[PDB]
């Protein structure tokens, strides 16, 4: 069994478990903001009703879902107060009464203050009805930029995805397990496991096409989605009054910042983050904007023996076939994946994402470079 202190949850893996809807009433008024974005950003009365709000103290969330929560409302609030609309009059000063309780709250999480993959995806949730199943129909997500935005889309597809993964996680330990106590039959039936349920989670990834439209998407979930590091709209970063002197450039929200097929690169041997390239460079540093559990899982993976070299060393095809399918179900996830971007970024960006295009690619070429037989 995996250790508790990585917070993975044998249901649904990273993702956060029932996370908390509401706030104590001494937040009515995040919420409210948080909750009505589409309204207040359209009616342009979203900057006005932040600068009226009052610095709340954050020591009534007193447990990691509240304060995940609180996060997840704070950074909503932060990329509709930058962005507005979303059509370039932008803010460069992020007001105290805002700043102050969402970096206080950052840094007791160890996340940074800005939106990250982890509160727009992983606790961005709820189940309609409690007694029924983890699917589309019976979810929905707690917060959204604009109407039309896709973003329970988006969001919920993600999700699902980093819940079809979760059956595969639960396997990791066995993995190792059998590794330490030289049992090959058990590595074999776990490794085919692994990759039986990575290739379910690609059926997942069709869904996308049911509630996510290109123009939508590009136009506008991506502006709210964007950060303030390498960004000509805010070229020194954003100053988080009363909280720093200084402007401080942060990355927006990116599934860079997932450890859902990361954990699997990590227990593969497929060196995602090794050398000096910019692929490397970018997951690496997408790390720290990843939960401190999640990044200790991952580091943690790391120093274990490797699975890769545990195969290559047995002179075994059966053993190297079941390892094979777990790269080759990863390099199909990524291939697909790719499709979608094509659609949803390259095309429209056509109509008016070359090195997003170049990230991904490098990112399949070395999973598939990863594979023992199959050239
Ligand atoms: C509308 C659909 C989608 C689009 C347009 C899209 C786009 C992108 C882009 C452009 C990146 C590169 C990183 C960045 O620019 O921030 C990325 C990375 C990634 N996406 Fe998506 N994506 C979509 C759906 C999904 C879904 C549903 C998942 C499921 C969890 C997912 C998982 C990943 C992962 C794991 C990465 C990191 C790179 C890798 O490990 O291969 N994506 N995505
Ligand atoms: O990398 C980003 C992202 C965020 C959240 C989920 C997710 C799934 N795949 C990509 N994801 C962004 C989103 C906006 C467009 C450019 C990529």
Redesign the pocket.
């Known amino acids: 069994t995996i250790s508790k202190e990585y917070h993975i949850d044998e249901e649904v893996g990273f993702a956060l478990p029932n996370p908390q809807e509401n706030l104590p009433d001494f937040y009515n008024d995040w919420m409210f903001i948080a909750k009505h974005l589409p309204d207040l950003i359209e009616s342009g009365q979203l900057r006005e009703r932040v600068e009226k709000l009052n610095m709340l103290s954050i020591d009534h969330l007193t447990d990691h879902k509240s304060q995940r929560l609180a996060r997840l409302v704070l950074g909503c609030i932060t990329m509709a107060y930058v962005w507005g609309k979303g059509h370039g009059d932008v803010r460069k000063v992020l007001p105290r009464n805002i700043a102050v309780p969402y970096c206080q709250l950052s840094k007791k999480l160890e996340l940074p203050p800005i939106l990250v993959y982890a509160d727009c995806?992983l606790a961005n949730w709820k189940k309609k009805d409690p007694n029924k199943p983890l699917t589309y129909e019976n979810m929905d997500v707690l917060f959204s930029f604009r109407d039309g935005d896709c973003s329970k889309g988006?969001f919920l597809?993600?999700?699902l995805?980093?819940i079809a993964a979760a059956s595969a996680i639960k396997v990791i330990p066995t993995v190792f397990k059998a590794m330490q106590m030289q049992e090959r039959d058990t590595l074999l039936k776990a490794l085919l496991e692994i990759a039986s349920c990575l290739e379910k989670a690609l059926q997942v990834?069709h869904q996308?096409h049911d509630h996510?439209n290109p123009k939508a998407?590009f136009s506008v979930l991506r502006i709210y989605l964007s950060g303030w590091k390498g960004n000509p709209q805010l070229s020194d970063g954003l100053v988080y009054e009363g909280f720093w002197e200084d402007p401080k450039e942060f990355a927006?929200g990116?599934?860079?910042q997932?450890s859902?097929?990361?954990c699997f690169?990590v227990l593969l041997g497929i060196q995602?983050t090794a050398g000096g390239g910019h692929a490397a460079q970018f997951?690496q540093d997408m790390r720290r904007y990843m939960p401190p559990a999640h990044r200790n899982f991952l580091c943690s993976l790391e120093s274990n023996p490797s699975v890769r070299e545990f195969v290559l060393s047995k002179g075994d095809a059966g053993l190297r076939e079941a390892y094979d399918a777990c790269v080759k179900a990863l390099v199909s996830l990524?291939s697909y994946?790719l499709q979608?971007?094509t659609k949803?970024?390259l095309i429209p960006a056509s109509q008016q994402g070359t090195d997003?295009m170049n990230?991904?690619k490098t990112?399949?070429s070395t999973t598939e470079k990863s594979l023992l037989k199959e050239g």
């Open positions: 995806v988006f597809v993600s999700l995805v980093e990834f996308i996510v998407f927006g990116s599934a860079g997932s859902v097929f990361q690169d995602q997951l990524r994946h979608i971007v949803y970024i997003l990230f991904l990112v399949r």
